[PDB]
C-alpha cells in the first residue's frame, strides 16, 4: 500500500459538497435537485451537509473561476470538521484547477473524497497527495435520484464508507438505467425506467489475479497524460485497471487509440487485470469489445483477464472503487471483489 | 539548436520509401499509385528510388508485423547510400514500432526523413534521436497526384531539400483540394477539382515572434503523450507549435480537450506562437477557431500569436516544416517564414 486510507464515516459526521467541474448545482432550475441529494445524505446516512463557499454560485461563475473551485477543495480538506467530500457533478474542465492545488494540504488532511467522470482529475489530486479517494456516486446523479435512491448504491456506500471490514465480492446490480429525465422539479415525482442487467462478461483470461485499483473515466484520464498530475511509475505495477466511458459515447476507434497509448506507456504490460464499466445506454457495447480485444492481440496480451459490463461509471446504480485498494478478478467464476476495507 | 540538420539532396541521390504505418502501397489495387509517385521522384527531381524489403508486402502483413516496419526504417538509416527517406502514406498504428526502434542507429546516420499524419510518430523517432525531420508530402498522397504534381508542392520540395539557403517567407497556395478521388488506376487520367484559397488568418496576436518548430498531427501527437517518445521539456521552450487535423475530422470539442492538455503540460505557456493547417475539406473551419480561442481565453493567452489556414496537413498542395528550424509569425503582415535552410 502506498496510499493513505481515510477514516470511516458515521452518523453525525459533517460532509462537504463541492463543484470542481460543472457548476450547475447552483443554477436556479437545478438547485432543487441538489437539495434533494442533500436530503438523502441527511436522512439515509444521518450526515450533516455543508456546501463550500463557491460551490453553489452557478455554472457561469464556476466556469470562469477555476481558482475559486480549487479554494473550495482546499477549504474542505483543511477544515477538520469535514470528514468527507462529495462532488456535486462531473464536467470537462477540472484540469484547469491544477495550477491552484496545494497537494500538501491534501496530504496533511486525509479524508473521504468521492465522485466520478471529470472528477477523475480531482481523484488524481488526492492520488498525487498519497490519499486514496473513491470513484463513486455524486450528489446530482445518484444521491438525488427521483422518488428513491437505488438500494444497490446505498448498500455500496454503507459497505465502502461506513465499515472498516473487507468489502468483499461485488455482485452485479439486478437492474440499471441511463434514461434521460430532465432535472426540472416538475419531474421529481417520476421514477426513471429500469432495464434488466445481464451481469459481468469475461472477455478474456483464465486465471485468478489480484492487483491494486487505478484508473477512472478513460476519456478524462487523457486530460492528465503527460502532465505532472499523471501517477508515478510504481502506481502502475501489479495493478487492476478500471475504465468507464462517459455520456459523449466516445467512438470505438478512440478506445482503441487510448488503449494503444497505455501499451506505449508500458502500463498494460504491468497490469494484472482490467475492468470496464457499462457504457451509458449500453451504446457501443459490442463495438468496444472488439477494439479492446484487438489491442490486446496487437501487444500479445490475450491472457490478461478483462471483465466487462460492471456497474460503475455513467449508469445507475453503481458501486464504489477505492483507489489503490486490492482487487480481485476470478475468471473461473467471472467475479470481482475488493479484498480490503475502503476506510479505516 | 538541438536537432541535427541533414545534408541537402541532389539529382542522382538514392531515396528510400517506407511503410511505417498503413501498408496499402503494396496492395494490388494501389501499387500503380505507388509507381506513379516513384515516377515523379525520378523525372521531376532526378532521384533514384528504392523500396525497403518489407515496405510493399501489403497492408495485411505490415499491420501484423510492426517489427518488420521498424527494421525497414533501420535499414534505410543504416544504408549510407540512402540520402533520404520518404513515407508512402500515414495510418494510425506506427506507435507500435516504438519497442523496436534503435535510436542510436538514427543518431549515427543523419539524413532526410519526410512524411505527415501518422508519420508524426516516426518524426518523433528522429526527434528523440536529435535529428531534424520534415513534416511534408508523402508518396501516395502528394508525389503521385494524378496527371501532374502541384507546382506549389514541387517548389517547396526544392526550396527545402535541394537548397541549403534560407527558405524564407512561405506564401499561401493559390488553390487547394482534398477531394476524394479513389486510388484505382481507372482514375489516373482524372484531375482533382481545385478550390480557391483565401490565405492565412490571424486569430490573435499583435507582435512579431520567432521560435523553433515542433508539433505535427494533433490527433497523432496524443498517441505519444505520456510515453518516452514525447520530446523533452527543453524542446518546448520558445517554440512555434504547429498542428493539423486528420481526415477523420476530429470533433471541435476534442481540439479543445487536446489544447487544454497542452496548457496542463505548460507547453502553451512556453510557446512563442502557434500555426494551424487547413482542415481537410475545411470541415469545422469556423468551429475550430472558436475552440482554439476559448482555450487561450481560459488560460490568459490572448496575446499569443496564432496563424490559421496554412497549407500543410491533410490538404494539397503542401509546404514543408523542418522540425526544430527557426520560424517566424509576423502579425503585422499575417505572414509566416522559416528563418533558415531545411538542409545543410
Ligand atoms: N439538465 C439535465 N437534466 C437531466 N440530466 C442531466 C442534465 N445535465 C446532465 N445530466 C445528466 O447527468 C450526467 C452527468 O454526467 P457527468 O457530467 O459525466 O458526471 C450526464 O451524463 C447526463 O446524463
Ligand atoms: N483508396 C483510396 N482512394 C482515395 N483516397 C484515399 C484512399 N485511401 C486513403 N485515401 C486518402 O488518403 C489520406 C490518408 O491520410 P493519412 O493516412 O493520414 O495520410 C486521406 O485523405 C484519405 O482520404
mmCIF file of C-alpha atoms in Angstrom, chain B residues 57-290:
data_model
loop_
_atom_site.group_PDB
_atom_site.id
_atom_site.type_symbol
_atom_site.label_atom_id
_atom_site.label_comp_id
_atom_site.label_asym_id
_atom_site.label_seq_id
_atom_site.Cartn_x
_atom_site.Cartn_y
_atom_site.Cartn_z
ATOM 1 C CA UNK B 57 4.302 -6.543 -48.819
ATOM 2 C CA UNK B 58 0.716 -5.306 -48.433
ATOM 3 C CA UNK B 59 -1.482 -3.880 -45.690
ATOM 4 C CA UNK B 60 -2.236 -7.222 -44.020
ATOM 5 C CA UNK B 61 1.407 -8.227 -43.491
ATOM 6 C CA UNK B 62 2.548 -4.747 -42.497
ATOM 7 C CA UNK B 63 -0.274 -4.423 -39.964
ATOM 8 C CA UNK B 64 0.702 -7.735 -38.341
ATOM 9 C CA UNK B 65 4.456 -7.049 -38.401
ATOM 10 C CA UNK B 66 5.366 -3.750 -36.687
ATOM 11 C CA UNK B 67 8.844 -5.150 -36.077
ATOM 12 C CA UNK B 68 9.226 -5.600 -39.834
ATOM 13 C CA UNK B 69 8.332 -1.927 -40.287
ATOM 14 C CA UNK B 70 10.935 -0.894 -37.717
ATOM 15 C CA UNK B 71 13.615 -2.992 -39.434
ATOM 16 C CA UNK B 72 12.784 -1.267 -42.721
ATOM 17 C CA UNK B 73 13.443 2.124 -41.117
ATOM 18 C CA UNK B 74 16.672 0.921 -39.537
ATOM 19 C CA UNK B 75 17.799 -0.480 -42.888
ATOM 20 C CA UNK B 76 17.185 2.831 -44.646
ATOM 21 C CA UNK B 77 19.001 4.859 -41.992
ATOM 22 C CA UNK B 78 21.970 2.497 -41.723
ATOM 23 C CA UNK B 79 22.442 2.292 -45.506
ATOM 24 C CA UNK B 80 24.953 5.057 -46.249
ATOM 25 C CA UNK B 81 23.862 5.130 -49.898
ATOM 26 C CA UNK B 82 20.355 6.223 -48.884
ATOM 27 C CA UNK B 83 20.328 10.011 -48.621
ATOM 28 C CA UNK B 84 16.605 10.465 -47.946
ATOM 29 C CA UNK B 85 13.615 8.518 -46.631
ATOM 30 C CA UNK B 86 10.004 9.144 -47.640
ATOM 31 C CA UNK B 87 6.926 7.565 -46.101
ATOM 32 C CA UNK B 88 4.421 6.109 -48.549
ATOM 33 C CA UNK B 89 1.349 7.032 -46.522
ATOM 34 C CA UNK B 90 0.069 7.619 -42.993
ATOM 35 C CA UNK B 91 -2.176 5.351 -40.945
ATOM 36 C CA UNK B 92 -2.853 5.078 -37.211
ATOM 37 C CA UNK B 93 -0.651 2.452 -35.516
ATOM 38 C CA UNK B 94 3.014 3.369 -36.084
ATOM 39 C CA UNK B 95 3.216 3.815 -32.315
ATOM 40 C CA UNK B 96 3.532 0.009 -32.275
ATOM 41 C CA UNK B 97 7.062 0.355 -33.713
ATOM 42 C CA UNK B 98 8.320 2.028 -30.539
ATOM 43 C CA UNK B 99 9.717 -1.067 -28.794
ATOM 44 C CA UNK B 100 11.715 -1.952 -31.935
ATOM 45 C CA UNK B 101 13.451 1.363 -32.687
ATOM 46 C CA UNK B 102 17.219 1.676 -32.305
ATOM 47 C CA UNK B 103 17.529 5.435 -31.795
ATOM 48 C CA UNK B 104 21.325 5.131 -31.854
ATOM 49 C CA UNK B 105 21.164 3.974 -35.485
ATOM 50 C CA UNK B 106 19.214 7.121 -36.350
ATOM 51 C CA UNK B 107 21.674 9.279 -34.410
ATOM 52 C CA UNK B 108 24.732 7.892 -36.190
ATOM 53 C CA UNK B 109 23.034 8.244 -39.581
ATOM 54 C CA UNK B 110 21.629 11.770 -40.062
ATOM 55 C CA UNK B 111 19.564 12.084 -43.246
ATOM 56 C CA UNK B 112 16.306 13.426 -44.691
ATOM 57 C CA UNK B 113 13.129 11.804 -43.377
ATOM 58 C CA UNK B 114 9.758 13.121 -44.542
ATOM 59 C CA UNK B 115 6.049 12.408 -44.141
ATOM 60 C CA UNK B 116 2.956 13.586 -42.264
ATOM 61 C CA UNK B 117 -0.159 12.459 -40.381
ATOM 62 C CA UNK B 118 0.540 9.172 -38.537
ATOM 63 C CA UNK B 119 4.129 9.600 -39.678
ATOM 64 C CA UNK B 120 4.302 12.166 -36.866
ATOM 65 C CA UNK B 121 5.278 9.210 -34.667
ATOM 66 C CA UNK B 122 8.196 8.408 -36.963
ATOM 67 C CA UNK B 123 9.171 12.070 -36.779
ATOM 68 C CA UNK B 124 9.275 11.654 -33.012
ATOM 69 C CA UNK B 125 11.674 8.707 -33.516
ATOM 70 C CA UNK B 126 14.027 11.057 -35.365
ATOM 71 C CA UNK B 127 13.338 13.868 -32.912
ATOM 72 C CA UNK B 128 14.282 11.784 -29.874
ATOM 73 C CA UNK B 129 17.441 10.835 -31.783
ATOM 74 C CA UNK B 130 18.269 14.526 -32.179
ATOM 75 C CA UNK B 131 17.668 14.525 -35.928
ATOM 76 C CA UNK B 132 15.654 17.250 -37.648
ATOM 77 C CA UNK B 133 12.967 15.644 -39.817
ATOM 78 C CA UNK B 134 10.464 17.113 -42.270
ATOM 79 C CA UNK B 135 6.708 17.336 -41.848
ATOM 80 C CA UNK B 136 5.802 17.257 -45.525
ATOM 81 C CA UNK B 137 4.405 15.378 -48.537
ATOM 82 C CA UNK B 138 4.265 11.579 -48.903
ATOM 83 C CA UNK B 139 4.404 9.244 -51.919
ATOM 84 C CA UNK B 140 0.776 8.202 -52.367
ATOM 85 C CA UNK B 141 -0.836 11.484 -51.325
ATOM 86 C CA UNK B 142 1.440 14.074 -52.982
ATOM 87 C CA UNK B 143 4.145 12.755 -55.330
ATOM 88 C CA UNK B 144 1.543 10.559 -57.034
ATOM 89 C CA UNK B 145 -1.001 13.303 -57.726
ATOM 90 C CA UNK B 146 -2.856 12.367 -60.922
ATOM 91 C CA UNK B 147 -1.818 13.999 -64.212
ATOM 92 C CA UNK B 148 0.792 16.189 -62.514
ATOM 93 C CA UNK B 149 2.157 17.329 -59.165
ATOM 94 C CA UNK B 150 1.099 20.712 -57.840
ATOM 95 C CA UNK B 151 3.834 23.232 -58.751
ATOM 96 C CA UNK B 152 3.485 24.644 -55.233
ATOM 97 C CA UNK B 153 4.471 21.330 -53.665
ATOM 98 C CA UNK B 154 7.336 20.890 -56.146
ATOM 99 C CA UNK B 155 8.605 24.382 -55.318
ATOM 100 C CA UNK B 156 8.626 23.671 -51.587
ATOM 101 C CA UNK B 157 10.443 20.364 -52.025
ATOM 102 C CA UNK B 158 13.160 22.179 -53.959
ATOM 103 C CA UNK B 159 13.394 25.171 -51.600
ATOM 104 C CA UNK B 160 13.605 22.910 -48.542
ATOM 105 C CA UNK B 161 15.524 19.778 -49.573
ATOM 106 C CA UNK B 162 17.595 20.816 -52.594
ATOM 107 C CA UNK B 163 18.775 24.220 -51.397
ATOM 108 C CA UNK B 164 20.927 24.865 -48.327
ATOM 109 C CA UNK B 165 19.866 28.515 -48.378
ATOM 110 C CA UNK B 166 17.251 30.194 -46.194
ATOM 111 C CA UNK B 167 13.726 29.046 -47.004
ATOM 112 C CA UNK B 168 12.213 32.418 -46.108
ATOM 113 C CA UNK B 169 8.585 33.503 -46.366
ATOM 114 C CA UNK B 170 6.031 30.833 -47.206
ATOM 115 C CA UNK B 171 3.367 32.328 -49.443
ATOM 116 C CA UNK B 172 -0.061 30.695 -49.416
ATOM 117 C CA UNK B 173 -1.034 28.397 -52.286
ATOM 118 C CA UNK B 174 -3.372 29.911 -54.912
ATOM 119 C CA UNK B 175 -5.648 26.847 -54.794
ATOM 120 C CA UNK B 176 -6.241 23.775 -52.621
ATOM 121 C CA UNK B 177 -8.052 20.439 -52.633
ATOM 122 C CA UNK B 178 -8.941 17.434 -50.508
ATOM 123 C CA UNK B 179 -11.336 15.787 -52.961
ATOM 124 C CA UNK B 180 -11.620 12.025 -52.587
ATOM 125 C CA UNK B 181 -10.672 10.502 -55.925
ATOM 126 C CA UNK B 182 -10.326 6.743 -55.495
ATOM 127 C CA UNK B 183 -6.770 5.464 -55.874
ATOM 128 C CA UNK B 184 -7.692 2.985 -58.608
ATOM 129 C CA UNK B 185 -5.842 3.053 -61.920
ATOM 130 C CA UNK B 186 -9.002 3.863 -63.883
ATOM 131 C CA UNK B 187 -8.803 7.394 -62.434
ATOM 132 C CA UNK B 188 -5.145 8.155 -63.199
ATOM 133 C CA UNK B 189 -6.080 10.473 -66.082
ATOM 134 C CA UNK B 190 -8.577 12.459 -63.991
ATOM 135 C CA UNK B 191 -7.572 15.701 -62.276
ATOM 136 C CA UNK B 192 -8.869 16.530 -58.830
ATOM 137 C CA UNK B 193 -11.007 19.672 -58.690
ATOM 138 C CA UNK B 194 -9.299 22.636 -57.015
ATOM 139 C CA UNK B 195 -10.783 25.287 -54.724
ATOM 140 C CA UNK B 196 -9.677 28.901 -54.395
ATOM 141 C CA UNK B 197 -7.539 29.544 -51.310
ATOM 142 C CA UNK B 198 -8.074 32.791 -49.385
ATOM 143 C CA UNK B 199 -4.773 32.874 -47.498
ATOM 144 C CA UNK B 200 -3.797 32.900 -43.833
ATOM 145 C CA UNK B 201 -5.923 34.136 -40.943
ATOM 146 C CA UNK B 202 -4.543 35.730 -37.793
ATOM 147 C CA UNK B 203 -6.810 34.557 -34.961
ATOM 148 C CA UNK B 204 -4.914 36.590 -32.369
ATOM 149 C CA UNK B 205 -1.557 38.207 -31.632
ATOM 150 C CA UNK B 206 -0.093 41.664 -32.210
ATOM 151 C CA UNK B 207 3.684 41.159 -32.149
ATOM 152 C CA UNK B 208 6.196 39.511 -34.482
ATOM 153 C CA UNK B 209 7.619 36.395 -32.839
ATOM 154 C CA UNK B 210 10.265 33.795 -33.630
ATOM 155 C CA UNK B 211 10.700 30.248 -32.341
ATOM 156 C CA UNK B 212 11.687 26.714 -33.341
ATOM 157 C CA UNK B 213 9.122 24.383 -34.913
ATOM 158 C CA UNK B 214 7.635 21.388 -33.125
ATOM 159 C CA UNK B 215 4.354 19.517 -33.475
ATOM 160 C CA UNK B 216 2.555 17.538 -36.156
ATOM 161 C CA UNK B 217 -0.864 15.907 -36.456
ATOM 162 C CA UNK B 218 -2.702 16.877 -33.282
ATOM 163 C CA UNK B 219 -4.559 13.557 -33.065
ATOM 164 C CA UNK B 220 -1.406 11.514 -33.569
ATOM 165 C CA UNK B 221 0.547 13.523 -31.002
ATOM 166 C CA UNK B 222 -1.932 12.274 -28.390
ATOM 167 C CA UNK B 223 -0.688 8.752 -29.127
ATOM 168 C CA UNK B 224 2.754 9.726 -27.811
ATOM 169 C CA UNK B 225 1.700 11.708 -24.736
ATOM 170 C CA UNK B 226 2.955 10.084 -21.541
ATOM 171 C CA UNK B 227 5.408 7.903 -23.447
ATOM 172 C CA UNK B 228 9.195 8.082 -23.579
ATOM 173 C CA UNK B 229 8.730 9.302 -27.158
ATOM 174 C CA UNK B 230 7.370 12.649 -26.001
ATOM 175 C CA UNK B 231 10.026 15.348 -26.619
ATOM 176 C CA UNK B 232 11.929 16.595 -23.551
ATOM 177 C CA UNK B 233 10.847 19.835 -21.890
ATOM 178 C CA UNK B 234 13.709 21.828 -23.437
ATOM 179 C CA UNK B 235 12.276 21.358 -26.941
ATOM 180 C CA UNK B 236 9.091 23.183 -25.974
ATOM 181 C CA UNK B 237 10.776 26.385 -24.767
ATOM 182 C CA UNK B 238 10.302 29.413 -27.051
ATOM 183 C CA UNK B 239 8.828 27.203 -29.744
ATOM 184 C CA UNK B 240 6.433 27.672 -32.630
ATOM 185 C CA UNK B 241 3.813 24.945 -32.292
ATOM 186 C CA UNK B 242 2.221 23.599 -35.460
ATOM 187 C CA UNK B 243 -0.898 21.432 -35.578
ATOM 188 C CA UNK B 244 -3.092 19.964 -38.283
ATOM 189 C CA UNK B 245 -6.224 17.814 -38.195
ATOM 190 C CA UNK B 246 -6.593 14.444 -39.914
ATOM 191 C CA UNK B 247 -9.065 13.049 -42.423
ATOM 192 C CA UNK B 248 -11.277 11.717 -39.642
ATOM 193 C CA UNK B 249 -12.422 15.304 -38.980
ATOM 194 C CA UNK B 250 -11.918 15.358 -35.191
ATOM 195 C CA UNK B 251 -14.858 16.995 -33.402
ATOM 196 C CA UNK B 252 -14.150 20.581 -32.233
ATOM 197 C CA UNK B 253 -14.616 19.506 -28.608
ATOM 198 C CA UNK B 254 -11.550 17.252 -28.882
ATOM 199 C CA UNK B 255 -9.448 20.134 -30.206
ATOM 200 C CA UNK B 256 -10.401 21.953 -27.012
ATOM 201 C CA UNK B 257 -9.578 18.961 -24.799
ATOM 202 C CA UNK B 258 -6.250 18.339 -26.512
ATOM 203 C CA UNK B 259 -5.292 22.025 -26.297
ATOM 204 C CA UNK B 260 -6.309 22.092 -22.633
ATOM 205 C CA UNK B 261 -3.830 19.240 -22.110
ATOM 206 C CA UNK B 262 -1.024 21.254 -23.719
ATOM 207 C CA UNK B 263 -1.789 24.005 -21.210
ATOM 208 C CA UNK B 264 -1.838 21.420 -18.417
ATOM 209 C CA UNK B 265 1.641 20.380 -19.577
ATOM 210 C CA UNK B 266 2.790 24.001 -19.542
ATOM 211 C CA UNK B 267 3.534 23.861 -23.270
ATOM 212 C CA UNK B 268 1.197 26.637 -24.417
ATOM 213 C CA UNK B 269 2.669 28.921 -21.757
ATOM 214 C CA UNK B 270 6.107 28.344 -23.319
ATOM 215 C CA UNK B 271 5.177 28.825 -26.969
ATOM 216 C CA UNK B 272 6.090 31.948 -28.927
ATOM 217 C CA UNK B 273 3.267 31.219 -31.355
ATOM 218 C CA UNK B 274 1.058 28.609 -32.999
ATOM 219 C CA UNK B 275 0.134 27.733 -36.576
ATOM 220 C CA UNK B 276 -2.749 25.571 -37.802
ATOM 221 C CA UNK B 277 -3.074 23.746 -41.099
ATOM 222 C CA UNK B 278 -6.187 23.951 -43.251
ATOM 223 C CA UNK B 279 -8.567 21.221 -42.036
ATOM 224 C CA UNK B 280 -9.456 18.535 -44.580
ATOM 225 C CA UNK B 281 -12.392 19.741 -46.676
ATOM 226 C CA UNK B 282 -12.311 22.823 -44.427
ATOM 227 C CA UNK B 283 -14.623 20.867 -42.126
ATOM 228 C CA UNK B 284 -15.162 22.590 -38.769
ATOM 229 C CA UNK B 285 -13.165 25.525 -40.147
ATOM 230 C CA UNK B 286 -15.014 28.092 -38.039
ATOM 231 C CA UNK B 287 -15.791 25.721 -35.167
ATOM 232 C CA UNK B 288 -12.095 25.012 -34.593
ATOM 233 C CA UNK B 289 -11.296 28.723 -34.349
ATOM 234 C CA UNK B 290 -13.880 29.046 -31.585
#
